Fold this sequence. Notes:
- The structure holds two protein chains of two kinds.
- By secondary structure, chain A is mainly β.
- In chain A, about 5% of the residues lie in helices and about 50% in strands.
- Chain A folds into two domains: about 1-105, no CATH class; about 110-210, Immunoglobulin-like (Sandwich), CATH 2.60.40.10.
- The chains are: A mainly beta, B mainly beta.
Amino acid sequence: DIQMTQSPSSLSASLGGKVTITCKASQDIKKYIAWYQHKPGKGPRLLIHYTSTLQPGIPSRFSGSGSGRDYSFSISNLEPVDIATYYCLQYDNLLTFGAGTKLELKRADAAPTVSIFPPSSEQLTSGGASVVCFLNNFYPRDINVKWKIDGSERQNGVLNSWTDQDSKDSTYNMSSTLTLTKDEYERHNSYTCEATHKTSTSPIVKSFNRNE
Amino acid sequence: QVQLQQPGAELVMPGASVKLSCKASGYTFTSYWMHWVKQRPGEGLEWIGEIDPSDSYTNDNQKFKGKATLTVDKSSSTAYMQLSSLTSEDSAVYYCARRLYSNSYYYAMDYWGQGTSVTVSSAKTTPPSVYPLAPGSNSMVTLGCLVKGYFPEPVTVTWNSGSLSSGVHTFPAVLQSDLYTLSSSVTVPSSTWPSQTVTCNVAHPASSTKVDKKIVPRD
């Protein structure tokens, strides 16, 4: 058995910059390492095998080096099409994939556009009530969303979903939903979602009042 | 012109078994080995095993002993992997991949299939409820709709039957009460809505659901 320790799990790279991924094997694998690119909804693609040998057609900005137990993979002059997840593979004794590295494209900061929505009349006929907050076109992905109900933070009952990084401007979008019972919803008047982000010192706050 | 053809997604109950297929074309089937690889939702790739089609020799990941069984059918240039006694831990995308030419016992893969998604679940096909998201009260106005409580994936959402495409965001579904929920948003000029009709069109093929939900100011 050969274990493979790939680092890091996630990376941000600037356009035209240089990326490095390392991979360490638990035993000597005699340069029998390969690197794969994987994009959502597609089959992986072999880039390099035997440590440094590019497959025909693969761009020269990919490279690999190493020996013994220690290996690395590099992308220079990084282009947008290189944003993907990357995996190393040893094949000296059986096969073992490393855990994977997710790349994202580093861009200029952007503050989110925030929108909040009350439960619909249709959902309130069912005894459940969802309040929804959209946070669109922000960067970085690292954002803190808090729900406040009549001034008090509500942490439980919230589900969040992030889109992938946008292929046209490299920002993110996010949806946050607070699902309550209908009577819980009807007990309070003020509903707020607030986002804390690098792009502002004070939170971006959006509220509504149920009776208004 | 190497082609590895795999079925689209499958849904089975816990305790079942499946036999996945991989139809190869564009090369001499018996001159290249075949690999199988597992990928759980949100996790990495995990090798299962490889088989030599010329003589059905195999070697495998020991974690899959008694779970995965690899075979081939030379006359049809197809490779198979049987997965037995399925649990929710077996829900994953399963890929086949051709091995680089080699006479070694172990070797790296070159061309991959697109993968078969296998979901192991006792949940039942359930149509979504579709809820409009209208704001409280600005030059761009954002609207949306909430597609709540459906199974299985996928759902599609369009706006004004496709006439509105710029500034449309549909979010990945999340699990809530062991059903899926998703939302979609569209941003239009405030001179457009509510002056003009904005409608979200939701389709859930597995339940034959088609709902057109007009967005109007909240009562």
